[PDB]
Amino acid sequence: PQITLWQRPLVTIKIGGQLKEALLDTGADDTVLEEMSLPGRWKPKMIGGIGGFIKVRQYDQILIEICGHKVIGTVLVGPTPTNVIGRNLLTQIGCTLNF
Amino acid sequence: PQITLWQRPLVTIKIGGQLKEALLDTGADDTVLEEMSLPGRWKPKMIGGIGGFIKVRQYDQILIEICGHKVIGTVLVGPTPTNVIGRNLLTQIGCTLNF
Ligand SMILES: CC(C)(C)OC(=O)N[C@@H](Cc1ccccc1)[C@@H](O)CN[C@@H](Cc1ccccc1)C(=O)N[C@@H](CCC(N)=O)C(=O)N[C@@H](Cc1ccccc1)C(N)=O
């Protein structure tokens, strides 16, 4: 739907059998979630933002249900304070900015 | 207008007589620009993101032209790698996410 930005744009996502809240972030190229138990294996990686850099595990081809829309893509798991849905998944569900 | 997320959502802003490029970020509550010469009074402040926290100066009541729309609000100036336009200004220009 159409979501304004008066409040943080938080949505419910279903990933790996679990329900979580995540922030839709147009300023993140990638999607990174707080530490959680995920299946399969990973390739380690480092990402940065405001503040500095962190280490995350990279899981590809993972299924996620965001506001119902099921999408498959890479998800990074690590020490991030909050779960963020990045552009790699946002394009998947046809998300656009408007004004 | 309507902007897809296949590429970073970069726009041109005019602030303090200067032209700069900034990333439209729905995941930032605040707007923070790389070090620049700004006139006026400020209160110091600290903000955080993924790799920890940084110190920035808080300049209030600042004018900015984003994609033509003039808006007035708080801007934070500091060691951010890129300039990001946060929700405090995005609501000013009527920006929404759609899908
Ligand atoms: C996630 C990934 C892929 C590593 O990308 C970024 O971190 N991108 C960030 C910087 C960047 C973008 C593009 C290229 C290079 C670098 C930017 O999108 C910021 N995204 C959010 C992600 C986020 C959100 C919530 C929590 C943790 C992380 C952010 O840090 N936003 C900050 C921006 C600074 C600001 N003050 O607005 C924010 O809103 N911080 C809040 C909330 C907060 C408090 C304390 C700690 C963390 C966050 C604040 N008031 O300080």
UniProtKB/Swiss-Prot annotation, chains A, B:
Domain of life: Viruses
UniProt region (Dimerization of protease), positions on chain: 1-5, 49-55, 88-99
Record: active site: 25 (for protease activity)
Domain Peptidase A2 stretches: 20-89
Subunit structure comment from the entry: Homodimer, whose active site consists of two apposed aspartic acid residues.
Name by which UniProt lists this protein: Protease
Origin species: Human immunodeficiency virus type 1 group M subtype B (isolate BRU/LAI)
Gene that this sequence comes from: gag-pol
